[PDB]
Structure formats: structure tokens, C-alpha cells
Amino acid sequence: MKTLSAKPAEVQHDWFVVDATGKTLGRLATEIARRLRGKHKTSYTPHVDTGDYIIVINAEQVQVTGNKALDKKYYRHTEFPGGLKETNFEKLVAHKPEEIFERAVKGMLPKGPLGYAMIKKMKVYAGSEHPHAAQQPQVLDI
């Protein structure tokens, strides 16, 4: 009919690079999730992926407020009896910052095949260097 949905073949995916130094995790993750889902484009379609690629550098410099550095705890469960594993943000940001960003953005993306497709477009690196110079990403601040 007259309201047309975006065709996946016709979608273009740009590449942006973001520095995470001295930024709040949640308020950065909201913008990251928005851009990954594609809400910023006027051709937004709920059943199609129209987002852009987002590279995150300096991930270990991400900050939290209050006492959350010591008090925010991350959990997982091995399906063995009594197998609950428990850690802290201070240790997790030192060990696997990519896990920090992955959890933060997964919590905000939809839960399904399309959400799994969208999350693959986020690239997270601890250092200030990334291996995608061939894609010529543009600087984006959010």
C-alpha cells in the first residue's frame, strides 16, 4: 500500500567510531542501541535492520557514578547444582570491558533473531586502535 517498508537489499550501513573515555555507561549505551537499531533514520522499519556499525575504543575508561564501581555485581549460573558465579565491575572492567558493553547493549536491544543480528554490528576494543581502517569509519560523539 502507500506506506512502504524498507527493503533490506536497499539498506546502506555506515561506519562510526566512538571514544568511551570519561562517559557514563548507560547514557552511552542508549545512543549506541538507538543507532544500532536504526531509529535515527526516516526509513525505520521494526522488522528490518537499518542501523549502522559502531566501533567503541578506550572501553576500559568507561565510568559509573556513586559507589557502583564496587557495588554493581555481575552474575552468571552454570547449570550445575549450586553453580552461581559472581563478580564486580572494578574487576570486570579490568578483565573484559567488551563483556561490560555487550551486557549493557544487549539489555537494551530486542530479544530475538533480529536483535542478535543488530548486536553483531557493535565492535568493542579496549585500546585506542581498531582493525577496521579499511572501512574508513567517521568520528561520532554520543
Partner 1 sequence: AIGLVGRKCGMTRIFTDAGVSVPVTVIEVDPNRITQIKTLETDGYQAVQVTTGERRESRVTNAQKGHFAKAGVAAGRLVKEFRVTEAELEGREVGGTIGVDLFTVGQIVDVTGQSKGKGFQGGVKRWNFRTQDATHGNSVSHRVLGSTGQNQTPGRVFKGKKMAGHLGDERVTVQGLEIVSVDTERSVLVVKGAIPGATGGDVIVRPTIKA
- By CB under 7 A, name the binding residues for RNA: 1-3, 26-27, 29-31, 33-34, 37, 39, 46, 65-68, 71, 75-77, 79, 81-85, 98, 102-111, 120
Interaction of residue 80 with partner 1, rule CB under 8 A: yes
Question: Of 75 and 80, which CB lies nearer to partner 1 in the complex structure?
Answer: 80
Angle in degrees, CA 70, 110, 12, rounded to 5: 110
**Interaction partner, residue 104 (partner 1, RNA, none; CB < 5-8 Å by kind):** RNA
Strand partners, 133: none
Q: Position of cell 552454570?
A: 78
Cβ proximity to RNA: between 82 and 127 the closer is 82
CA dist 3 → 6, 28, 44, 45, 106 (Å): 10, 33, 12, 11, 30
